[PDB]
Amino acid sequence: PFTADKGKCGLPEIFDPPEELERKVWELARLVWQSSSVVFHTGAGISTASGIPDFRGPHGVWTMEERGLAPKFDTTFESARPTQTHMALVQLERVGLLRFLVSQNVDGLHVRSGFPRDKLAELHGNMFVEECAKCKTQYVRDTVVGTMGLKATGRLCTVACRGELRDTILDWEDSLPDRDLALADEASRNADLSITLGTSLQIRPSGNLPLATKRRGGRLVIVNLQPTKHDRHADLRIHGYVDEVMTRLMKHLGLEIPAWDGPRVLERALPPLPRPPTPKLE
Numbered sequence: 618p619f620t621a622d623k624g625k626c627g628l629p630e631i632f633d634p635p636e637e638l639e640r641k642v643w644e645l646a647r648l649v650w651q652s653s654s655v656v657f658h659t660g661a662g663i664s665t666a667s668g669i670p671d672f673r674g675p676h677g678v679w680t681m682e683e684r685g686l687a688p689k690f691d692t693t694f695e696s697a698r699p700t701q702t703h704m705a706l707v708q709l710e711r712v713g714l715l716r717f718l719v720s721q722n723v724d725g726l727h728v729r730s731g732f733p734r735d736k737l738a739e740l741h742g743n744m745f746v747e748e749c750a751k752c753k754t755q756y757v758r759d760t761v762v763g764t765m766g767l768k769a770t771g772r773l774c775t776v777a778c779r780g781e782l783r784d785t786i787l788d789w790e791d792s793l794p795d796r797d798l799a800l801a802d803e804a805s806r807n808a809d810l811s812i813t814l815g816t817s818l819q820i821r822p823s824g825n826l827p828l829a830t831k832r833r834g835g836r837l838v839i840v841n842l843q844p845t846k847h848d849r850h851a852d853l854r855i856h857g858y859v860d861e862v863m864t865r866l867m868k869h870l871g872l873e874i875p876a877w878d879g880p881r882v883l884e885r886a887l888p889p890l891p892r893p894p895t896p897k898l899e
């Protein structure tokens with residue numbers, strides 16, 4: 618835990634020049650249009666623009682620790698608002714363009730943004746989510762569940778149970794949740810396009826899931842300011858702010874980025890909304 622391998626921290630940022638950025642985002646549009654099954658992989662870099670530092674960016678939690686420095690939060694978990702990237706993922710799921718979302722983030726922002734839980738895998742757990750040790754019933758709170766490392770919170774299951782409620786925050790030794798991992802892996806294996814957003818892909822097996830898309834000839838796209846573990850394997854690497862990449866992509870897709878109505882929890886994906894017609898490519 619003290620000894621835990623925190624991988625490579627504080628690598629240089631890469632900034633694609635704007636004409637190269639414009640080009641690459643058009644190409645991402647073309648891949649989205651060509652794909653039958655698109656899966657998104659998120660990590661801590663999609664929340665930095667909400668005030669939440671990452672792990673391994675220049676001001677990452679682990680990076681700043683390596684140097685004797687403290688990470689800075691510009692918000693609480695509760696006051697954090699989903700980013701333009703978070704809201705674009707909501708929209709792309711609603712128009713049938715996103716088959717599944719896989720997140721290593723515990724920041725709770727995908728759920729609070731209103732993203733259907735039956736189309737999300739929270740690999741590392743969710744700070745607002747406790748789970749009944751007895752009946753496995755999960756509870757999505759309006760505040761952070763106060764424990765980490767799957768400890769009893771002090772609340773009991775109210776299901777028609779009295780089970781001890783625990784946090785969902787994985788510790789270093791903790792195996793990932795079988796349910797989330799299995800659906801993530803299946804979605805990743807069966808996808809024809811895997812897009813990674815603000816993750817350095819250094820965690821096994823979370824950071825490996827995008828490579829599964831590569832077998833049977835799926836395409837892998839990586840959006841990240843820093844190098845990532847699998848950059849070699851990517852058909853397209855875009856070095857820019859995800860908010861800028863996602864905003865430009867949505868405009869190419871003819872989609873608006875919807876308003877956030879404050880923290881909401883959708884259990885189950887709604888019926889798919891209309892989407893603009895597809896460009897002729899060739």
Ligand SMILES: Nc1ncnc2c1ncn2[C@@H]1O[C@H](COP(=O)(O)OP(=O)(O)OC[C@H]2O[C@H](O)[C@H](O)[C@@H]2O)[C@@H](O)[C@H]1O
Nearest residue numbers: 660661662665671672673674721815816817842843858859
């Ligand atoms: N606005 C931004 N736009 C684009 N890229 C960004 C931005 N902000 C940060 N990045 C990049 O985003 C990347 C964030 O990578 P890491 O910080 O390692 O987060 P993980 O999600 O991959 O961490 C995996 C797990 O490991 C931990 O122990 C926890 O358990 C995590 O769950 C960096 O490369 C930044 O360059």
Ligand SMILES: [Zn+2]
Nearest residue numbers: 749752774778
């Ligand atoms: Zn229970």
